[PDB]
Amino acid sequence: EFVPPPECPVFEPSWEEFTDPLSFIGRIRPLAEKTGICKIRPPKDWQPPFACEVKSFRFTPRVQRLNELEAMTRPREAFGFEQAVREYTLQSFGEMADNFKSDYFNMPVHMVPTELVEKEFWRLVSSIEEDVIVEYGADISSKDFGSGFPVKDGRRKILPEEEEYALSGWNLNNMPVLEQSVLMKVPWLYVGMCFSSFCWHIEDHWSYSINYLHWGEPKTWYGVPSHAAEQLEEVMRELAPELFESQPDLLHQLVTIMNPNVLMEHGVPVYRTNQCAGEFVVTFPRAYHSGFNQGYNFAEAVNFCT
Numbered sequence: 001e002f003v004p005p006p007e008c009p010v011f012e013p014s015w016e017e018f019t020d021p022l023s024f025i026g027r028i029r030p031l032a033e034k035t036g037i038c039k040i041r042p043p044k045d046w047q048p049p050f051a052c053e054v055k056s057f058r059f060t061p062r063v064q065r066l067n068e069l070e071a072m073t074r075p076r077e078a079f080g081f082e083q084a085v086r087e088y089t090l091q092s093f094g095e096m097a098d099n100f101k102s103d104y105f106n107m108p109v110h111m112v113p114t115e116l117v118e119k120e121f122w123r124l125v126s127s128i129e130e131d132v133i134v135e136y137g138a139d140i141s142s143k144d145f146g147s148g149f150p151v152k153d154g155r156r157k158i159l160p161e162e163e164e165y166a167l168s169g170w171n172l173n174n175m176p177v178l179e180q181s182v183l184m185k186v187p188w189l190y191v192g193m194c195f196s197s198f199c200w201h202i203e204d205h206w207s208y209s210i211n212y213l214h215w216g217e218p219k220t221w222y223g224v225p226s227h228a229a230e231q232l233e234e235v236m237r238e239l240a241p242e243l244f245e246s247q248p249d250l251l252h253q254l255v256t257i258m259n260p261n262v263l264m265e266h267g268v269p270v271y272r273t274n275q276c277a278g279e280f281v282v283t284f285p286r287a288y289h290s291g292f293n294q295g296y297n298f299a300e301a302v303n304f305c306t
């Protein structure tokens with residue numbers, strides 16, 4: 001079955017090192033740049049409150065058919081109308097997500113080993129006999145219902161115990177986002193359920209990205225260092241569906257799902273991590289990454305510049 005890639009680096013900075021994100025990322029770069037991704041665990045006392053407007057938080061998630069590329073191998077009757085379209089609140093999405101996972105594995109959602117969800121995910125992606133369909137609240141703009149981090153503005157109220165987090169350099173709203181040049185830049189939200197996923201991609205302009213899991217079950221990641229970017233792209237073209245082979249990268253990476261073991265078999269280095277609630281994941285410039293969610297969770301991401 002699936003062989004898990006080696007673990008990416010995890011850093012546990014002291015309060016002194018936790019002072020400036022860009023200074024810290026600059027210092028860990030000699031190691032983290034060689035794995036493409038790294039995980040950062042903040043000091044134990046660093047616990048930002050969740051600041052989204054939860055009562056009015058409503059969204060229509062995207063439908064994900066795990067084996068859609070494998071099923072390209074007579075089209076189905078009335079294709080394009082498989083799943084009925086559902087709108088959710090945070091609470092009703094969570095109820096759906098937990099019922100899906102507990103029903104799927106026949107055990108309570110917190111008892112399912114992360115290694116089993118991983119093994120099953122990659123089996124389902126390549127399975128022609130079983131068609132599993134899930135939903136992902138992905139790419140929700142933080143301008144919609146606010147950031148998960150507290151921010152200083154007239155939108156909501158900030159308590160004194162909250163203000164340190166509104167002002168923190170690790171608040172994703174306070175990251176630098178303006179690239180220097182001769183002359184949408186806000187965080188985005190992701191409401192996950194078991195098996196919801198993001199396929200292999202790099203960021204626009206080869207940007208760094210930083211990713212925070214506010215709460216919930218882990219987000220499983222795979223990363224490739226930037227020195228292997230060209231090798232991954234060559235493996236993709238060789239093994240991607242012929243109909244998509246000529247597509248430009250920006251469109252191709254909407255459907256570049258590929259088992260990490262296939263890349264490893266072709267000599268591409270791949271690292272993994274389970275990002276748990278309260279942890280950051282940083283992706284380095286031109287570091288390909290992909291992943292999936294273990295269950296109901298809430299993440300926030302932003303592209304930043306150095």
Ligand SMILES: CCN(/C=C/N(C)C)C(=O)CNCc1cc(C(=O)O)ccn1
Nearest residue numbers: 138139188190197198209299301302303
């Ligand atoms: C900074 C967030 N962003 C910008 C998206 N807009 C184009 C809508 C990205 O493209 C980030 N890349 C997608 C992604 C999504 C996930 C996820 O679904 O958790 C993890 C890692 N990377």
Ligand SMILES: [Mn+2]
Nearest residue numbers: 202203209289
């Ligand atoms: Mn990304």
